[PDB]
Amino acid sequence: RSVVSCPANCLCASNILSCSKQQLPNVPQSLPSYTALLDLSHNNLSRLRAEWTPTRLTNLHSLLLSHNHLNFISSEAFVPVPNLRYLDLSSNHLHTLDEFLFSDLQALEVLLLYNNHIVVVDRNAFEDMAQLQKLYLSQNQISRFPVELIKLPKLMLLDLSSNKLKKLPLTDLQKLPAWVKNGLYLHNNPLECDCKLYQLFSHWQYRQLSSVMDFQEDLYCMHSKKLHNIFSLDFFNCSEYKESAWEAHLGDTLTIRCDTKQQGMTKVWVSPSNEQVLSQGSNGSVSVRNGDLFFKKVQVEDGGVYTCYAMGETFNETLSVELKVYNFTLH
Ligand X SMILES: *[C@@H]1O[C@H](CO)[C@@H](O[C@@H]2O[C@H](CO)[C@@H](O[C@@H]3O[C@H](CO)[C@@H](O)[C@H](O)[C@@H]3O)[C@H](O)[C@H]2NC(C)=O)[C@H](O)[C@H]1NC(C)=O
Which residues are at the interface with ligand X (CB under 6 A)? 23, 25, 44, 46
Least separation in angstroms between CB 159 and a copy of itself: 4
Out of 45, 65, 67, 246, point to the residue binding a copy of itself (CB under 8 A): 67
Q: Which does 23 bind (CB under 5 to 8 A by kind): a copy of itself, ligand X, none?
A: ligand X
Out of 7, 9, 22, 34, point to the residue binding a copy of itself (CB under 8 A): 34
Stretch that binds a copy of itself, among 13-21, 71-79, 98-106, 287-295 (CB under 8 A): 13-21
Nearer to ligand X, 69 or 296 (CB): 69
Q: Which does 91 bind (CB under 5 to 8 A by kind): ligand X, a copy of itself, none?
A: a copy of itself
Q: Which does 21 bind (CB under 5 to 8 A by kind): a copy of itself, ligand X, none?
A: a copy of itself
Q: What is the Cα–Cα distance from 297 to 253, expressed in whole angstroms?
A: 5
Nearer to a copy of itself, 10 or 256 (CB): 10
Least separation in angstroms between CB 180 and a copy of itself: 14
Tell me how far apart the 2 most distant CA atoms of the chain are, in Å: 84
Out of 107, 157, 238, 248, point to the residue binding a copy of itself (CB under 8 A): 157
Is residue 294 involved in binding a copy of itself (CB under 8 A)? no
Q: Which does 25 bind (CB under 5 to 8 A by kind): ligand X, a copy of itself, none?
A: ligand X
Is residue 90 involved in binding a copy of itself (CB under 8 A)? yes
Q: What is the Cα–Cα distance from 18 to 69, expressed in whole angstroms?
A: 19
Residues at the site binding a copy of itself, with contacts judged by CB under 8 A: 1-5, 11-16, 18, 20-21, 32, 34, 41-42, 66-67, 90-91, 112, 114-115, 136, 138-139, 157, 159, 161-162, 185, 187-188, 210, 214-215, 217-218
